[PDB]
Paper text:
Remarkably, this modification is regulated by only two antagonistic enzymes: the O-GlcNAc transferase (OGT), which transfers the GlcNAc moiety onto acceptor residues from the donor sugar nucleotide UDP-GlcNAc, and the O-GlcNAc hydrolase (OGA), which removes it. OGT is a multi-domain protein with a catalytic core at the C-terminus and 13 tetratricopeptide (TPR) repeats at the N-terminus, making up about half of the enzyme. Here, we exploit a novel approach to covalently trap OGT-substrate complexes to explore how OGT recognizes glycosylation substrates through its TPR domain. Here, we used a fusion approach to trap OGT-substrate complexes to investigate the role of the TPRs in recognition of glycosylation substrates.
A well-characterized OGT glycosylation substrate is the TGFβ-activated kinase 1 (TAK1) binding protein 1 (TAB1), a pseudophosphatase involved in the TGFβ-mediated inflammatory signalling pathway and found to be an essential activator of TAK1. We have recently discovered that TAB1 is dynamically O-GlcNAcylated at Ser395 in the C-terminal domain. The O-GlcNAcylation sites on the OGT substrates TAB1, collapsin response mediator 2 protein (CRMP2) and casein kinase 2 (CK2) are located in disordered regions close to the C-terminus. The structure of the OGT in complex with the TAB1 C-terminal domain combined with mutagenesis studies reveals that OGT recognizes the TAB1 substrate, and by extension a group of glycosylation substrates with similar disordered regions, through extensive essential interactions with the TPR repeats. The TAB1 C-terminus binds in an extended conformation in the TPR domain, making extensive contacts with the concave surface through regularly spaced asparagines in OGT. In this work, we have shown, using crystallography and site-directed mutagenesis, that the OGT substrate TAB1 binds the enzyme in the same way as the proteolytic substrate HCF1 and that the five asparagine residues found on the concave surface of the TPR domain (Asn321, Asn322, Asn356, Asn390 and Asn424) are important for binding. Although the similarity to the HCF1 peptide binding mode and the presence of glycosylation on Ser395 suggests we have trapped a physiologically relevant TAB1:OGT complex, we further tested this model by structure-guided site-directed mutagenesis in the context of truncated OGT (312–1031) and TAB1 (7–409) as separate proteins. Two types of OGT mutants were generated: a single-point mutant in the active site (K842M), known to be essential for catalytic activity and a quintuple mutant where the five key asparagine residues that form the bulk of interactions in the TPR domain (Asn322, Asn325, Asn356, Asn390 and Asn424) were all mutated to alanines (from here on referred to as the 5N5A mutant).
Residue numbers in the entry: 292 to 745, 763 to 1028
Write the structure that this text describes.
Amino acid sequence: HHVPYSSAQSTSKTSVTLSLGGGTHADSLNNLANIKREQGNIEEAVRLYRKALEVFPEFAAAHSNLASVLQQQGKLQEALMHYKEAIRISPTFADAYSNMGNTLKEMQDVQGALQCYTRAIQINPAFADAHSNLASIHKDSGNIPEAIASYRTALKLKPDFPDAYCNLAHCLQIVCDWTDYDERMKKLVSIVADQLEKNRLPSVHPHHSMLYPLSHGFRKAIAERHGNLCLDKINVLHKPPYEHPKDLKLSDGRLRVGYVSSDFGNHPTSHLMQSIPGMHNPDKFEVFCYALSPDDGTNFRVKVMAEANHFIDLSQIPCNGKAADRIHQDGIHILVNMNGYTKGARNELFALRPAPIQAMWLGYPGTSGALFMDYIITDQETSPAEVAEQYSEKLAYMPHTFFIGDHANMFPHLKKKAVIDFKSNGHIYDNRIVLNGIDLKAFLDSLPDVKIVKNMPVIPMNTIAEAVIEMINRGQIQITINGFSISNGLATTQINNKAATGEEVPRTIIVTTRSQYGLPEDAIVYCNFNQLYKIDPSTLQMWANILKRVPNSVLWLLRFPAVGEPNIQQYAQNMGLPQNRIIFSPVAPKEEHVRRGQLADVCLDTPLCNGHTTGMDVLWAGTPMVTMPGETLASRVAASQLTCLGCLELIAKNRQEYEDIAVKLGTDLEYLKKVRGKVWKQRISSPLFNTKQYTMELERLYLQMWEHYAAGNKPDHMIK
Ligand SMILES: O=c1ccn([C@@H]2O[C@H](COP(=O)(O)OP(=O)(O)O)[C@@H](O)[C@H]2O)c(=O)[nH]1
Ligand SMILES: *[C@@H]1O[C@H](CO)[C@@H](O)[C@H](O)[C@H]1NC(C)=O
């Protein structure tokens, strides 16, 4: 039940062994193979390793070395056999164990990888590669402190160690340890430079590149190499180019589109587009959904399977070749890659080119940097032609924004709201005490004294009102008033967990209060619900500047992760900024997270990496978001969202403007009222949350794509 989010792919470090003082013929073969591996001639290396084995059957080094390459080629079962052989021959061969660990990890045997890694450490405490690998497991597991400790050990043992350093850098970012941030940024760029120069795979993951000050070429370059990793996996298959359909005849004139995701389940991707396959037009389209992950038991998974014309669990088709064949057999014209370099990706499928047109959509906010993807679906705001070079792909534009969300369908209970005038006579607030429900109006009919403000219903300091706040104060789950169920916002899982996760719409009327979260009733609340890694020192300062200008305001953030909080506080103090100025809350179930958005006055977006899903989440609550688009795609999503929404006023051209916009909202209350009103109104009226329309616009784009292809034309930008 842990929250899912976009995360990068796991990574491990392979160690190559040199054999000396051994058989000369063999040593040469093994050592030469090592050279080839460095150069990317995997096939050649494999042969040499085998030959070495033929010459010297009990060559431990050869076994391990061959195994690593095989692993690289996805031949995991085979690799394991060889690793074991190496160990039998040499029980204290630490390199073999560490390497074996990587394979198991790849097979998902975490407990197994751990044992292998630890054993290697036990054999050789001075083994740096092992320490790094151990660190990755901890990092993946969420034990960032250990990962940091382990990474430091590797670095201590081996100072020039890029994989460890970069991973360490990523770790620091997650918990916001900005110690020597400037230098760190400097070192990373340097490493990438050195690596790119040396035709080595960059230690900086493509997902991570967005957070560091790298040139666009470098980021694109980084992605490309990771693209290359895929070919090696598929070249072994030795498959021939597929034959692609040139007409829709076999398909009854219906365009065949397939969506490939490891995220059909409780993941942000589903939260955004679960509704779309269902909304496709049966007359002109056939929808195939290809799942890269097993059924998680979620309604999200259920809905997509039922709604799509065809659902295929490639989860059960581990062999990439077979899977691609399956897609081809399905006669797909457009295949959409929704993972990019994200956890669960099988870009190998895309490398094989099972379809005529392959497009990147929604899931990964970056370019594939790879040859196998023809287009990246975007919007003009998000991807201006000025920066097309930043992308390997051709740009296919969406009319307003490429982004979409399923909030309308998922959280209709937030369409309307009501409040309690607690103070009560002086001042009526829209965000101190809030009520949301399917049955709200019905409930309101029962209360004669409610006052309508326009618009918004306000409940006075009633006997009823008294009871509700009492429930909140006492921590009760829910209460019944005139037969209606009024429930504590903090207790939704207790009442119904499907409700808490967004699996189902909540039945009861929910009370959300500032008191629940320790927020002030007398001040402006500025918020950000993103993962802490999206924050850099620069952003905090900007936020600090803003806070300094609004006297009793506060910043609301999440323990995402929790170890991050102390760091943020200290840094803030250095800048401003008493501790009371920043308030942290724990991560919450999806519904509550979206709902508590109503409590905030304004949301301050993160410039380095914008909130994407998070941006939609905030908007649905009718809370204005201030943003400053940057060069990267990931830095421009929020602006695109706002533009679609209709609030150009919230987009900032520079830091001064951003601070200014925020400050005005904080200080000019009528303006705040006005802007909030716009957002509340527009989320509905705008096309931002309109799934049917979005799907329609999308269908439009595909056909443009298809016609172009049918015309015998290679991909080119689509700016209609
Ligand atoms: O208290 C919270 C805060 C966030 N989220 C969700 O956590 C995920 C965060 O994902 P990611 O960090 O990938 O967000 P994005 O980059 O798309 O904004 C999203 O589904 C948010 O709705 C949540 O469920 N509860
Ligand atoms: C996380 O996932 C959503 C949906 O796939 C995607 O739109 C978003 O860009 C991802 N976030 C990041 C930071 O990659």
